[PDB]
């Protein structure tokens, strides 16, 4: 797996170049925002159960056929598998946010996830809706706008990390 620093290194290695001043400056900015990134990861992981359960519940409430017979959330077994796969997606999104790069997300979660869900019959649209509700909840927790949870953090702009979380969730949704 790659982080932001390893991503920069890989990009530099494709050119057989030492890490340039611009890439070094980008990674220095990453480091200077590192405390903000750690707070964002803490916000996501401290409410991970809430995020996953709320997203699955919203996906079901918007698509009640999921819990109907033949639906993919009927059968508590399938519900637990759905909550588990949503928690796994959020876990890998948090890994990507902590690393600053989506390599871990794609390689360990999204590679073959679309094919796996097609084989299982997991609905792509409902999974995308769940991932998008996770996106909104995680973004709110990053910006501490979550109406039902206020993580005490120093005042500042974390919209870059919120956009990063949104981009990781979009990558998950586009993978499936």
């Amino acid at each position: 797996m790659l982080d932001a620093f390893s991503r920069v290194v890989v990009n530099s290695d494709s050119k057989a170049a030492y890490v340039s001043g611009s890439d070094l400056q980008a990674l220095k900015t990453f480091i200077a925002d590192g405390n903000k990134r750690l707070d964002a990861v803490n916000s996501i992981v401290s409410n991970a159960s809430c995020i996953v359960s709320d997203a699955v519940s919203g996906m079901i409430c918007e698509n009640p056929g999921l819990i109907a017979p033949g639906g993919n959330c009927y059968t508590n077994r399938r519900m637990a598998a759905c909550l588990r796969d949503g928690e796994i997606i959020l876990r890998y999104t948090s890994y990507a946010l902590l690393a600053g790069d989506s390599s871990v997300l794609e390689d360990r979660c999204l590679n073959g996830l679309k094919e796996t869900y097609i084989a299982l019959g997991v609905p792509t649209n409902s999974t995308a809706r769940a991932v998008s509700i996770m996106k909104s909840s995680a973004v709110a927790f990053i910006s501490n706008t979550a109406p039902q949870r206020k993580m005490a953090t120093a005042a500042g702009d974390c919209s870059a990390l919120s956009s990063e979380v949104a981009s990781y969730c979009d990558k998950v949704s586009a993978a499936i």
Binding site: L24, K28, I31, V45, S94
Partner: protein, 164 residues
């Protein structure tokens, strides 16, 4: 790529757990050490050509037998390949300093290096001499700060230990 972030995330993924307090603490260590790491990396990136030249010159001075026929430095082509190898290693050291771990070195210059050098009759002692010269040539605070020097010498010592 072996780094603080990747090591902690891989451990968490193997345990199937969200990033915890220890993972964020390790990333905080990445944040704190990044100053010296990137100082050493930037200095190496800005002065690598001279450093590589000096390392290659020391390698061939300590082992003039390399220029003998049938040896690794028996032609200008593979003398330049020796300098290019030292440049590759120094670039991987720059990558390691940027990354915060031996990942780039491990995956791109160390993995399989022993087999290549045995198959191509490249004595690891010559690489070791070049890197030892680079390590002992570093001067503080002239070339970099003390902690940047620690990072740079640690990367060089890691390469040396991978070769010996």
């Amino acid at each position: 790529m072996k780094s603080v972030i990747t090591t902690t995330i891989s451990a968490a993924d193997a345990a199937g757990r969200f990033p915890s307090s220890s993972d964020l603490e390790s990333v905080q260590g990445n944040i704190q050490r990044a100053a010296s790491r990137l100082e050493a990396a930037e200095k190496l990136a800005g002065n690598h050509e001279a450093v590589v030249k000096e390392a290659g010159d020391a390698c061939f001075a300590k082992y003039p037998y390399l220029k003998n026929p049938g040896e690794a430095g028996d032609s200008q082509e593979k003398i330049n390949k020796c300098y290019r190898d030292i440049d590759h290693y120094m670039r991987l050291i720059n990558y390691s300093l940027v990354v915060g771990g031996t990942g780039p070195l491990d995956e791109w210059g160390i993995a399989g290096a022993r087999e290549v050098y045995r198959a191509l009759n490249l004595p690891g002692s010559s690489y070791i001499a070049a890197f030892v010269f680079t390590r002992d040539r570093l001067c503080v605070p002239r070339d970099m700060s003390a902690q940047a020097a620690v990072e740079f010498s640690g990367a060089l010592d890691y390469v040396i230990n991978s070769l010996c």
